[PDB]
Every structure is written in C-alpha cells, then in structure tokens.
Design an enzyme around this catalytic site. Sequence first.
Site, short mmCIF file in Angstrom:
data_model
loop_
_atom_site.label_atom_id
_atom_site.label_comp_id
_atom_site.label_asym_id
_atom_site.label_seq_id
_atom_site.Cartn_x
_atom_site.Cartn_y
_atom_site.Cartn_z
N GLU A 297 0.65 6.50 7.40
CA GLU A 297 0.18 5.80 6.23
C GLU A 297 -0.83 6.76 5.59
O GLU A 297 -0.71 7.08 4.42
CB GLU A 297 -0.42 4.43 6.61
CG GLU A 297 -1.56 3.86 5.75
CD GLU A 297 -1.18 3.41 4.33
OE1 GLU A 297 -1.87 2.50 3.77
OE2 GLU A 297 -0.22 3.95 3.75
N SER B 147 -5.77 2.71 9.73
CA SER B 147 -4.64 2.55 10.55
C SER B 147 -3.88 3.83 10.17
O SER B 147 -3.62 4.06 9.01
CB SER B 147 -3.89 1.29 10.13
OG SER B 147 -3.17 0.72 11.21
N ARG C 193 0.81 -1.24 0.00
CA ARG C 193 0.00 0.00 0.00
C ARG C 193 0.84 1.29 0.00
O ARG C 193 1.02 1.96 -1.03
CB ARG C 193 -0.95 0.03 1.22
CG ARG C 193 -1.69 -1.26 1.54
CD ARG C 193 -2.31 -1.19 2.94
NE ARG C 193 -2.80 -2.47 3.46
CZ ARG C 193 -2.07 -3.36 4.15
NH1 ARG C 193 -0.79 -3.14 4.42
NH2 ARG C 193 -2.64 -4.50 4.57
#
Length: 295
Positions: A287, A217, A168
């Site tokens: 992220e 997250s 990702r």
Amino acid sequence: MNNLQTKFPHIAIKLNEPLSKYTYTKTGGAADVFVMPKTIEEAQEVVAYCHQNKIPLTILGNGSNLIIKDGGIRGVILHLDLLQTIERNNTQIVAMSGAKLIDTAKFALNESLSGLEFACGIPGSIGGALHMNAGAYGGEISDVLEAATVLTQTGELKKLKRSELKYRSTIAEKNYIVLDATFSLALEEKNLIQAKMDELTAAREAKQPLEYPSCGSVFKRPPGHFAGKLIQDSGLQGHIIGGAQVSLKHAGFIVNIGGATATDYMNLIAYVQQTVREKFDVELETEVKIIGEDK
Ligand SMILES: Cc1cc2nc3c(=O)[nH]c(=O)nc-3n(C[C@H](O)[C@H](O)[C@H](O)COP(=O)(O)OP(=O)(O)OC[C@H]3O[C@@H](n4cnc5c(N)ncnc54)[C@H](O)[C@@H]3O)c2cc1C
C-alpha cells in the site's frame, strides 16, 4: 537544472538533503534539490520551472505513506510544509496542503463540525490525504471533500469541485499538486463528535504501534484475508532486519526500532512478501509508496 537557486533566491531551498529528517519512518536517501515554498506563487514558479526543463519533480508530504530508497531521489522534491493554514467558513473547513490532517480533525471538533472524526488519528499532510483518499473506520476523505486548489504539471492553478474529484482519488491520476482543501461538514454537538474521537483514538491505540516511527499498514488487503493475519500466520511477527521489525503489536506494520534504513524496510518488505507467498500463495502488494532508486 543546477541553476534553480539563482532564479529564485527568497525561496527556501536545500542542497542534497537527506530526507529521513522529514519522513515518518525516519528513512530515505537524500534528494539532490529540496524546496520549501512560503507561497502558492512560489510553488508555481518551481513546478513550472521543473516542467519546462524536464526535471523530474516529486512532492513529499510527511512520508507517513512512503519509503524512499537510500539511492535517494532524482530531480526536485517539493515540501509544502510552510503552507499550513486551517480556516473556519460556516459549515465548511479550508486547510492548506501542508497542514496536518490530525490538526484539521481537531479544528473541526472545536467548531462542532462532523464528518472528519475518522481522521483524528491518520498521520500526514492534507496534500497526502487528498492524494491517497485517506480513510479509516469506514470513513474517507472523498466522503467529505468539497473542493480543492491544485497545480497542474505545467504549474497552473486549477480550482476543483466535487464532480471533478473521484478505496485508498482522481488527484492521483492527473498528477495534481494539492495546495489547499475544502471539506463540506455538518453541524452537530461537540459531545457526539467527542465520543467518536475518543472511541477512535482508543481503537487505534489499542491496535497500532503509534510509539514507533513507521509507515502505515504496509500492504493492501488481499481478497478475503487480513494482511496482518497472514503475516502473523507465516511466522513473521517480530522478525527483524537491521533496525526494521514486523511489529509485535500489528503484524502489518514495519516499525523502526532505531536506526532503520530504507534498505532495511525494502529488505523486510520483500522477505515478508516472499515468505507469505510460499506458505499461502498469496500476493501481498504494498500500500505504502516506494520511490528513489537503488543506492
Ligand atoms: C501509524 C500510521 C497509521 C496510518 N493510518 C492510516 C489510516 O488509518 N488511514 C489511511 O488512509 N492512511 C493511513 N496512514 C498512511 C498515511 O497517514 C496517509 O496515507 C497520509 O494521508 C499520507 O500523508 P503524507 O502527507 O505522509 O503523504 P506522503 O507519505 O508524504 O506521500 C504520500 C503520497 O501523496 C503524495 N503527496 C503528498 N503530498 C501531496 C500534495 N500536496 N499534493 C499531491 N500529492 C501529494 C506523495 O507524492 C505520495 O504519492 C497511516 C500511516 C501511519 C504511519
């Protein structure tokens, strides 16, 4: 520039729109020029127009993976909410970039198509999914991405294949605006896919605050550590700043216990990053995407 609505009436556009209405965290300052195209050609004209006039352009999916500062965002923000279509095509699934990834995994199951199970619980749009090579439970979009229709920064369509698509996405670089996606699935019994989807929903529900708005997250996983575990270990679980909280259910999630602001998010993110590096000397890198500037 200020002149856009003139050229294109018939293209749903909005003035100084606060983005929290469209984001999964329900936060973000306003974006000065907010556009929603009903058509691919509409998307083209706007992308080309902004390019030619050197107006910074941003594509917003459902912000399930970004935080937008309260200073807002400069330029034009394009939201392809109206490009919603999902289609059956033998063993292949075609979905527009404004379609929700969860709906695309629901479809797949109605057709006895396997390969998407991993996305029955991943929030956001198809466009965001390809951009992020979204994945969960050892599964990932690149595992089944067949083809994609895209817009280059100049506004031209470009139809892509596997070869040209490559934790990702080559979509991220090359800065392509995804318009629709084609997934190569395989035929398999409903029951078997069902058992995975139930398994996956059970799993995710057990461990994630799905009740609260959040991004996902918040941090990438630090070499050989769990984000959540470090956070929890640093005494940050339950921590609150304004309306933001390090989730009592999953320490790697910052939930919105009501009226949180992007400032609150940025502030909690930085305090966590800072506290963690003091107790363990580990760099938590976000992220989730960070965009707009400081109000
Ligand atoms: C509770 C929760 C759970 C989550 N679980 C997961 C998970 O298990 N796995 C996982 O991988 N992710 C997960 N996420 C993050 C998020 O769901 C994915 O990153 C998602 O694919 C992003 O979708 P979006 O449409 O919200 O993108 P946005 O957050 O709107 O933006 C994401 C990025 O993609 C770009 N973008 C958006 N649309 C397009 C488009 N059409 N063309 C080109 N670029 C575009 C944006 O400009 C930005 O860079 C989770 C998030 C939440 C809140």
